[PDB]
Design a protein around this ligand. Structure first.
Ligand SMILES: O=c1ccn([C@@H]2O[C@H](COP(=O)(O)OP(=O)(O)OP(=O)(O)O)[C@@H](O)[C@H]2O)c(=O)[nH]1
Ligand SMILES: [Mg+2]
Ligand SMILES: [Mg+2]
Ligand SMILES: [Mg+2]
Ligand SMILES: [Mg+2]
Length: 319
């Protein structure tokens, strides 16, 4: 596959530009160490677990950590963190308790240090296990995801709070394309594997075929450039957000918003692979979806261009 040699070259250069460095990764793991020790100072029965992009390997540089306390203790933890010289915010008695650390004055992790600490978020820990597994399965996934995230931030469509879509949402659109759209698939669907064993946590099946070494190498040999082009095209032109659900529970990836009963927020429907009642795209508005689709189409057009060379840089330019 040399269909996208130049786009691919550019893609890997950008990737090496934006990927989290090994020194920042090391700092983040040392901060987790520090934070786990502080937690162990208040209860021996509480555990501190990383999840999200740092844990699965899908992290951009200058990214925030996603932490989870596993085991009323939140308040106590919060107070010890501040006493320890950390700066942060927390609202006791919140439905979803959250400690947001925004700074460190004493522990060496910088005035810009940020992480969110949730409590008993086991589903996020499991979906992170899935994403880790897939990044282990194929070497093209990590860079593809970093590039999609970078693009979505640059284009201003990575704002859940402001009508667009979480980074996690983007990762799932990527996986779904890799699994159920592209032929041949880069990836099998690990949830639907005949070898998958059910495993119930907080009411949902988080079981998946996790025996990676028994998974055969991808029969798709496309280049990174080709995969990205195909992805942008699928969401620009083929996927129908008004009627379809991105899903990981159908052998052919076909799911209608009406079977799902997701017909009244469901502008963009992305069914979480484990938390099946959660629409990861719940934050996408009518206007946010129009802007998202607009960006998919412009990206598609850029890469379908007839001229040469193609100004690939515009793919990650602002606005
Ligand atoms: O709807 C959601 C959102 C998030 N999560 C859980 O939150 C984690 C982080 O959610 P993010 O959207 O922040 O993922 P990310 O780490 O890849 O994004 P960046 O910081 O790099 O911009 C996810 O990886 C997932 O485990 C959910 O389980 N469900
Ligand atoms: Mg994050
Ligand atoms: Mg979450
Ligand atoms: Mg097409
Ligand atoms: Mg563009």
């Amino acid at each position: 596959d040399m269909s996208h040699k130049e786009f691919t070259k550019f893609c890997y250069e950008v990737y090496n530009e934006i990927k989290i460095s090994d020194k920042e990764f090391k700092e983040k793991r040392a901060a987790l160490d520090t934070l786990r020790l502080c937690l162990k100072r208040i209860s021996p029965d509480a555990e501190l677990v990383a999840f999200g992009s740092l844990e699965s390997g899908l992290a951009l540089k200058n990214s925030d950590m996603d932490l989870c306390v596993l085991m009323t203790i939140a308040l106590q933890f919060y107070e010890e963190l501040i006493a320890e010289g950390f700066e942060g915010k927390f609202l006791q008695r919140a439905r979803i308790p959250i400690i947001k650390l925004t700074s460190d004055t004493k522990n060496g992790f910088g005035a810009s240090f940020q992480c969110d600490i949730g409590f008993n978020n086991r589903l996020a820990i499991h979906n992170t296990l899935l994403l880790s597994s897939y990044t282990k399965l194929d070497a093209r996934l990590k860079p593809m995801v970093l590039l999609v995230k970078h693009w979505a931030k640059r284009k201003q469509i990575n704002s859940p709070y402001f009508g667009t879509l979480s980074s996690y949402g983007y990762v799932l659109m990527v996986l779904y394309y890799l699994i159920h759209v592209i032929k041949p698939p880069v990836f099998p669907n690990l949830l639907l594997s005949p070898l998958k064993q059910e495993k119930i946590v907080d009411g949902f099946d988080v079981g998946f075929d996790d025996k990676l070494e028994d998974i055969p190498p991808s029969q798709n040999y496309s280049s990174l450039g080709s995969l990205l082009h195909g992805f942008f095209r699928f969401y620009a032109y083929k996927f129908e957000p008004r009627e379809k659900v991105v899903t990981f529970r159908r052998p052919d990836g076909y799911l209608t918003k009406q079977e799902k009963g997701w017909t009244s927020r469901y502008i963009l429907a992305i069914e979480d692979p484990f938390e099946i009642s959660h629409n990861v795209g719940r934050t996408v508005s009518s206007s946010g979806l129009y802007r998202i689709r607009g960006e998919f189409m412009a990206a598609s057009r850029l890469l379908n261009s007839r001229s040469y060379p193609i100004p690939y840089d515009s793919l990650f330019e602002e606005a």
